[PDB]
C-alpha cells in the first residue's frame, strides 16, 4: 500500500511506503484524531523480537543483511538475552541507534543534520560525579566557543528499573524560577517546580532572574546529587535589538546551547533513561516561546510599552508587532556574538528539502505538522502548505515521567 | 474511552464524550495520523433509512421530545416516504436545525461560537439558474446588511439521481479574477486562474483588471451552467489603508467584505444538498496573511517590505514577518474604519476557547481540527495553540465535492 502527500504551494506530490515499517501506535483511530494531544521493566519475553528487528535494520543499512556477521550477531544477542535477560549494544549499533532515533523524531524540524550527530558513549559511568564529568565534556564539545555541534551522551541502559540513570534537569542548561509570596514569579516560570527541588536538595539560590540551575544527577537508582556547571562552560548571549537601543536595558540574556535531557532513548528494545542531547536553537524557540508565552517570561507587555504601541485594542496587533521585534533581537544578538542560531524561514526550508530527500532515498519521513510549523508566521513558511504523515518508527526518543514522581528515596 | 483534552497554558481539562457519537471516519489509523492531509452514485433506500432515523432521533432529543408521539409519528412518516419515493423531504424546522448543526460540527471552523444565529434561506423551490441568481442576490444583500454582516446559508434543491445537481460553480460567491500573462506571471488573483478561464470559455468578457469581481456560474437541475453578473452595489468592498503609512493606499489594494463559500456539499439525514452557499464574516488573517501574502496568492510581501526599506537580503532580518504584521494591521484598520464586520485572530481564537468550554459544558465536547483552528500567524500567542483538541466527524456536516467541470455532462 502506497500513500501520498501533497505540497499545496508547489503541487509537488511524494509517495510514502516507509509508514508500513511502523509498529508502534499513534494514538489515533478511524473515528478520532489525536494529532494535537501533547502525549497520547521490560522482560526477556518481548525483548528478542525487538532486538532482532533492530539488528535487521542495522545490518540492512550497512549492506550486510543475511551475512554471517549478521546471523552470528543475532545468535550472540539471543543467547545473551536468555542468559542475562538483557543485552549490550556494540558501539557501532549504539551510534546507528542514536542517529536514527533523531532521524525518526517526527516532531523535529532540524533533522536535516541527523547524520552528523556526535555520539558520546557513557555506558561505563557508575556515579553522579562520573555523570557530571561526562556532561561537562558534552557541554564543552557541543558549545565549541559558539560554533555549535550536535551531540548526545548516553548513560547506562535500564536494567530492572530500580537502578535508573536520570538527569533530573529537563535541559542541561536552564534558568531558575522563583515563586514569590506576592504571587509573582522571578526568573523562568517554566522551571519553578524543578528549582524548588534543587533548593530542597541543598542548592543555594542566588534568586536572580537568570540563575543557571545546578545539575541534579541520578546514577544507578541512587538519590540524585547536585553539581554546578563551571560558569565558563555556560555560553550566554546578551539580548539586544539592532534598532531599539532601549532593548538592552530590558536586561535579557539567553544561553546558547539547547540540550534536552529528560527523554528516553529506545534502541532495539533497550531503554536509555539518561541520554542528554543537544544541537542549536531555532530563534523562535527563545523569542516566541521562551519570552512571550503567557506562562513564561512574558515580556510582550514590556516591549509593547517601550515601542509605544496601542495596547488598548488587540486588533492593533501590538502583540504580533512586539513578538516580531523580540525575535529579530534574538537572532541579531546570537549572530552578533557568532553563536549558532537558525531562523524559522531557513529551518523550515531546510526541512522541506530534508523531507523530499527522505521520501526518495528512504520511502518516507514521519513528520508532525502540529509541531513542525513554527509558532509565528506559519503560513509564510513552506511547511505550512506541506501535507505530512505522522507515524512512529524505532529507534526513537520517548517521553518518560519526571523522576521525582516515581523515585524511591534512599535517604 | 471518555477522553480528556488539556489546555497547557491554563491547565484547564475537559472531558469528551461527544466523540462517541461519531459516525464517519477521520482518515487516520492506529499506525498513521493523517491530521495534516487536506482531504483524507446516490444513497440506496437501505442506507438512507438509518441516516434519517439518526438525524431525526437527535432532532427530537434537541427539542426534549425524544420518545414522543410526534417523534415516533414523524419517524414512521419518513419511514413510509422513503420506502415509496426512494428519498424524502425535510420539514422546515429540521432543515434549519440541520444547517445550524452542520456549522456547529465544522471541526475546522474557528468562528463557530455564532453557530446558532444562522439565517437559513430555503431555496428548495428553485428550478433555474436565473432563480438561483435571484436567491443568491438576496442572500448577498441580506448577509452584507450595509457592512453589519449577518450569517446566512441558502439551500437549493437536494440531489436526486446525481444527474440533476444544483451547483454553484464559483468557489465563493464573491472572488476576484486571475489572469495568466504572456509575460509569464499572473495578474489579479492567482488562486482563481482556472475558474477565470472557464468563465471566459463560457462567454465572460473579462475587463482584465486586478480586482475584477468574477461572474456567477450557476447550474440548476443538472443543466449547462449560466453566467450572471452580481450587481456591484451588492458587493461591499473595503479599500486597504494603513493607520501609520500613507504610502500604503498607493498599493491599490481592496478586498470584499463578504466571505461566502459556495462549492461545498451539505449533508443532513443522508440527504445531499450540492448547492448551499453560506457566508459569515472574515477573520483578518484570511485576507491579509493568506489572500495577500501566500506565495501562491497575491504575494505582495516583497513590494510591501520594499516600500518599508527593510533589509531583504537575509531571511533572519525577519522582514517578511514584519511586513506580514503591518498588512494585517491595515486590513483590520480598513474594515473597522469603514464599519464592516471583521474579527482579529486574537479575538476569534479567544471566542473559540470560550465556545469550546460551552460545548464541553452543554454538549459534552466539540470536534476541532487544531491544524486549521490555529491562525496562520502568531500561533503560540493565541490561546488555541496551547489547546489540545479532538477531531472527529459528526453529522449533519459540510463536505468537499468534485469541481463541477470535472463532472458535468454537457
Ligand atoms: C541541530 C539543530 C536542531 C534544531 C534547530 C532542532 C529544532 C527543534 C524544534 C524547533 C523542535 C520543536 C520542539 C519545541 O518547539 O519545543 C524540536 C523537537 C525535537 N527535537 Fe530537534 N532540533 C535540533 C537538533 C536535535 C537533536 C541533535 C536531537 C536529538 C539527537 C533532536 C531531537 C528532537 C526531538 C526528539 C524533538 C521532539 C520532542 C518532543 O516530542 O517533545 N533535535 N527540534
Ligand atoms: C461568522 C464568522 C466566521 C468566521 C470568523 C469563520 C472563520 C473560519 C476560518 C478562519 C476557517 C479556516 C479556513 C481557511 O483558513 O481558509 C473556517 C473554515 C470553515 N468554516 Fe467558518 N467562519 C465563519 C462562519 C462560518 C459559517 C456561517 C459557516 C457555515 C454555516 C462556516 C463553515 C465553515 C466550514 C465548513 C469550514 C471548513 C471548510 C473546509 O473544511 O475546508 N463558517 N472558518
Ligand atoms: C515548549 N514545548 C515543550 C514544553 C515540549 C517538550 C517536551 C520535552 C520533553 N520531555 C522535550 C522537548 O524538546 C523539544 C526539543 C528537543 C531537542 C531540541 C534540540 C536538541 C535543539 C533545539 N534547538 N530544540 C530542541 C527542542 C519539548
Ligand atoms: C485557504 N485554504 C483554502 C484554500 C481551503 C478551503 C477549501 C474549501 C473548499 N472547498 C473551502 C474553504 O473554506 C473555508 C471557509 C469556509 C467558510 C468561511 C466562512 C463562512 C466565513 C469565513 N470568514 N471564512 C470561511 C472559510 C477553504
Ligand atoms: C496543544 C498543542 O498540541 C501543544 O501546545 C503543542 C502544539 N504544537 C507545538 N509545537 C511546537 N513546536 N512546540 C510545542 O510546544 C507545541 N505545543
Ligand atoms: C498542508 C496543510 O494541511 C494545509 O496547508 C492546511 C494547513 N492548515 C490550514 N489552516 C487554515 N486555517 N487554512 C488552510 O488552508 C490550511 N491549510
Ligand atoms: Zn490523526
- The DSSP line for A161-220 is SSS--EE-SSBSS-B-EEE-TTS-EEE-GGGHHHHHHHHHTT------TTPBPPEEEE-T
With b meaning 16 or more CB within 10 Å and e meaning fewer, what string describes A16-38?
A: bebbeebeeebbbbeebbbbbbe
User: In 10 A of CB A346, how many CB atoms?
Assistant: 16
Distance between CA atoms of A305 and A311, rounded to whole angstroms?
Answer: 8
Hey, of B7, B282, B380, which one would you mutate to test binding to chain A, going by the most A CBs within 10 A of its CB? B380
* Contacts with B24 from chain A: Cβ below 8 Å: 31
> Is there a contact between B380 and A376 if contact means CB atoms under 8 Å apart?
yes
Cβ atoms A297, A317 nearer than 8 A = no
| H/E element, B279 | strand B278-279
| Backbone φ, ψ for residue A16 (5° rounding) | -95, 120
Cβ atoms A30, B29 nearer than 8 A = yes
Cell of A63: 549492506
Q: Collapsing DSSP states into helix, strand and coil, what is residue B9?
A: coil
Is B172 marked as a binding-site residue?
A: yes
Cβ atoms B166, B277 nearer than 8 A = no
- Give the up-direction half-sphere exposure of residue A267: CA atoms within 13 A in the CB hemisphere: 27
Q: Which residues line ligand 6 (CB under 6 A)?
A: A 8, 384-387; B 36, 38, 371-372
Give bridge partners of residue B238 from the DSSP assignment: B255
Q: Which residues line ligand 4 (CB under 6 A)?
A: B 259, 261, 263-264, 278-283, 286, 290, 400
Name A304's Cβ contacts closer than 8 Å, sequence gap at least 6.
A311, A318, A319, A321, A322
Cβ atoms B287, B331 nearer than 8 A = yes
Q: Which residue of A has its CA nearest to B190?
A: A9
Distance between CA atoms of B154 and B166, rounded to whole angstroms?
Answer: 12
Radius of gyration over alpha carbons of chain A, in Å? 23
| Backbone φ, ψ for residue A59 (5° rounding) | -70, -30
User: In 10 A of CB A251, how many CB atoms?
Assistant: 10
Beginning with the edge strand found earlier in the chain, give each strand of the sheet holding B278-279 in spatial order.
B119-122, B152-155, B278-279, B260-261
Residue with the smallest CA separation from ligand 1 atom 36 is A108
Name A276's Cβ contacts closer than 8 Å, sequence gap at least 6.
A135, A138, A152, A153, A167, A172, A259, A260, A261
Distance between CA atoms of B383 and A318, rounded to whole angstroms?
Answer: 16
For residue A232, with 0-12 CB atoms within 10 Å meaning exposed, 13-18 middle and 19 or more buried, which class applies?
exposed
Query: Which chain residues have CB less than 5 Å from ligand 7, an ion?
Result: A 28, 33, 35; B 28, 33, 35
Cβ atoms B152, B139 nearer than 8 A = yes
* Contacts with B370 from chain A: Cβ below 8 Å: 35-36, 370
List the one residue out of A130, A138, A123, A132 whose CA is nearest residue A93.
A123
Angle in degrees, CA A56, A92, A361, rounded to 5: 55
Is A134 marked as a binding-site residue?
A: no
Q: Which mutation among B376, B377, B385, B391 tests ligand 6's pocket best, with the greatest number of atoms within 8 A of CB?
A: B376
CA distances for A98 relative to A10, A94, A101, A118, A142, angstroms: 33, 6, 5, 9, 16
DSSP string of A96-133, one letter each residue: HHHHHHHHT-TT-TTGGGGGG-EEEE-TT--SHHHHHH
* Ligand 3 atom closest to A400 (CA): 10
Residue with the smallest CA separation from ligand 6 atom 12 is B372
Cβ atoms B188, B211 nearer than 8 A = yes
Residue with cell 548571549: A237
Cβ atoms B263, B248 nearer than 8 A = no
Angle in degrees, CA A285, A283, A342, rounded to 5: 125
Long-range Cβ pairs for the range B117-122 (8 Å, 24+): B117/B151, B118/B151, B118/B152, B118/B153, B118/B278, B119/B143, B119/B150, B119/B151, B119/B152, B119/B153, B120/B95, B120/B96, B120/B152, B120/B153, B120/B155, B121/B152, B121/B153, B121/B154, B121/B155, B122/B92, B122/B95, B122/B155
Q: Is the CB of A399 under 6 A from ligand 3?
A: yes
Q: Is the CB of B359 under 6 A from ligand 2?
A: no
With b meaning 16 or more CB within 10 Å and e meaning fewer, what string describes A264-296?
A: bbbbbbbbbbbbbbbbbbbbbbbbbbbbbbeeb
CA distances for A381 relative to A189, A286, A373, B110, angstroms: 30, 18, 8, 21
CA distances for B259 relative to B173, B176, B280, B291, B333, angstroms: 8, 12, 6, 12, 18
Question: Given B315, B344, B377, which is nearest A315 (Cβ)?
Answer: B344
Distance between CA atoms of B380 and A296, rounded to whole angstroms?
Answer: 12
Distance between CA atoms of B343 and B114, rounded to whole angstroms?
Answer: 13
Give bridge partners of residue A3 from the DSSP assignment: A16
List the one residue out of B132, B167, B130, B138 whose CA is nearest residue B266.
B167
Q: What is the resolution of this structure in A?
A: 2.0
Q: Is the CB of A397 under 6 A from ligand 1?
A: yes
CA distances for B287 relative to A98, A133, B255, angstroms: 44, 55, 8
Work out whether the CA dihedral A262, A266, A267, A270 comes out positive or negative.
positive
* Widest distance between CA atoms in chain A: 73
- Give the up-direction half-sphere exposure of residue A106: CA atoms within 13 A in the CB hemisphere: 22
Instruction: List, in sequence order, every beta strand (DSSP E) within B109-243.
Output: 119-122, 152-155, 167-168, 178-180, 186-188, 216-219, 226-228, 237-239
Q: How far is the CA of B8 from the centre of ligand 5 (A)?
A: 9
Orientation of helix A91-103 relative to helix A47-61, angle to 10°? 90
Distance between CA atoms of A347 and B56, rounded to whole angstroms?
Answer: 51
Cell of B123: 431555496
Name B407's Cβ contacts closer than 8 Å, sequence gap at least 6.
none
H-helix segments, B145-203: 193-201
> Is there a contact between B381 and A346 if contact means CB atoms under 8 Å apart?
no
Angle in degrees, CA B351, B354, B355, rounded to 5: 85
Distance between CA atoms of A96 and A267, rounded to whole angstroms?
Answer: 9
Is A198 marked as a binding-site residue?
A: no
| CA B263 to the chain's CA centroid | 9
* Determination technique for this entry: X-ray
Q: How far is the CA of B193 from the centre of ligand 7 (A)?
A: 33
Cell of B98: 440541520
Q: Is B370 left (phi over 0), alpha (psi -120 to 50) or beta?
A: alpha
* Contacts with A384 from chain B: Cβ below 8 Å: 376
> Is there a contact between B294 and A388 if contact means CB atoms under 8 Å apart?
no
Is B371 marked as a binding-site residue?
A: yes
Cell of B229: 453578473
Name B155's Cβ contacts closer than 8 Å, sequence gap at least 6.
B95, B99, B120, B121, B122, B123, B124, B266, B273, B275, B276
Work out whether the CA dihedral A101, A102, A103, A104 comes out positive or negative.
positive
Cell of A313: 485594542
Structural domains in chain B, sorted by start: 16-124+151-161+265-279+349-373 (3.90.340.10), 125-150+165-236+400-404 (3.90.440.10), 237-259+282-347 (3.90.1230.10)
Q: How far is the CA of B154 from the centre of ligand 2 (A)?
A: 16
Q: How far is the CA of A89 from the centre of ligand 6 (A)?
A: 43
| Backbone φ, ψ for residue A249 (5° rounding) | -70, -5
- Give the up-direction half-sphere exposure of residue B160: CA atoms within 13 A in the CB hemisphere: 11
Distance between CA atoms of B210 and B176, rounded to whole angstroms?
Answer: 8
List the one residue out of B123, B379, B139, B83 whose CA is nearest residue B274.
B123
* Contacts with B289 from chain A: Cβ below 8 Å: 379-380
Cis peptide before B396 (omega within 30 of 0): yes
Cis peptide before A169 (omega within 30 of 0): no
Count A/B contacts: CB-CB distance under 8 Å. Answer: 209
Amino acid at each position: 500500500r502506497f500513500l501520498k502527500v501533497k505540497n499545496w504551494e508547489t503541487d509537488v506530490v511524494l509517495t510514502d511506503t516507509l509508514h508500513l515499517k511502523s509498529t508502534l501506535e499513534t494514538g489515533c483511530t478511524e473515528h478520532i484524531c489525536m494529532g494535537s494531544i501533547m502525549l497520547p521493566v521490560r522482560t526477556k519475553d518481548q525483548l528478542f523480537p525487538l532486538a532482532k528487528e533492530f539488528l535487521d535494520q542495522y545490518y540492512s543499512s550497512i549492506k550486510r543483511f543475511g551475512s554471517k556477521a549478521h546471523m552470528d550477531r543475532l545468535e550472540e544477542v539471543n543467547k545473551e538475552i536468555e542468559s542475562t535477560s538483557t543485552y549490550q549494544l556494540k558501539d557501532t549499533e549504539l551510534i546507528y541507534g542514536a542517529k536514527h532515533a533523531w532521524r525518526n523524531a517526527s516532531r523535529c524540524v532540524g533533522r536535516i543534520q541527523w547524520s552528523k550527530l556526535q555520539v558520546f558513549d557513557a555506558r561505563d559511568c557508575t556515579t553522579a560525579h562520573g555523570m557530571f564529568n561526562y556532561i561537562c565534556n558534552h557541554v564543552k564539545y557541543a558549545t565549541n566557543k559558539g560554533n555549535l555541534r550536535s551531540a548526545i551522551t548516553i548513560f547506562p541502559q535500564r536494567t530492572d528499573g530500580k537502578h535508573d540513570f536520570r538527569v533530573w534537569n529537563s535541559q542541561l542548561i536552564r534558568y531558575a524560577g522563583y515563586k514569590q509570596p506576592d504571587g509573582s514569579t522571578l526568573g523562568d516560570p517554566a522551571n519553578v517546580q524543578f528549582t524548588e527541588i534543587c533548593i530542597q536538595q541543598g542548592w543555594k539560590a542566588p534568586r536572580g532572574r537568570f540563575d543557571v540551575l545546578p545539575l541534579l544527577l541520578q546514577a544507578n537508582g541512587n538519590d540524585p546529587e547536585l553539581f554546578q556547571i563551571p560558569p565558563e562552560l555556560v555560553l550566554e548571549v546578551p539580548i539586544r535589538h539592532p534598532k531599539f537601543d532601549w532593548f538592552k536595558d530590558l536586561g535579557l540574556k539567553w544561553y546558547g546551547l539547547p540540550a534536552v535531557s529528560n527523554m528516553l532513548l529506545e534502541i532495539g528494545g533497550l531503554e536509555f533513561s539518561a541520554c542528554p542531547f543537544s544541537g542549536w536553537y531555532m530563534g523562535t524557540e527563545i523569542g516566541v516561546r521562551d519570552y512571550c508565552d503567557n506562562s513564561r517570561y512574558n515580556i510582550l507587555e514590556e516591549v509593547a510599552k517601550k515601542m509605544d504601541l496601542d495596547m488598548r485594542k488587540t486588533s492593533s496587533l501590538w502583540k504580533d508587532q512586539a513578538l516580531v521585534e523580540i525575535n529579530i533581537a534574538v537572532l541579531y544578538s546570537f549572530q552578533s556574538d557568532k553563536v549558532t542560531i537558525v531562523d524559522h524561514h531557513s529551518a523550515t526550508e531546510s526541512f522541506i528539502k530534508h523531507m523530499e530527500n527522505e521520501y526518495r532515498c528512504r520511502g518516507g519521513c514521519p513528520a508532525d505538522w502540529v509541531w513542525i510549523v513554527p509558532p509565528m508566521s506559519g503560513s509564510i513558511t513552506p511547511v505550512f502548505h506541506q501535507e505530512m504523515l505522522n507515524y512512529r518508527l524505532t529507534p526513537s526518543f520517548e517521553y518518560q515521567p519526571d523522576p521525582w514522581n516515581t523515585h524511591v528515596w534512599k535517604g
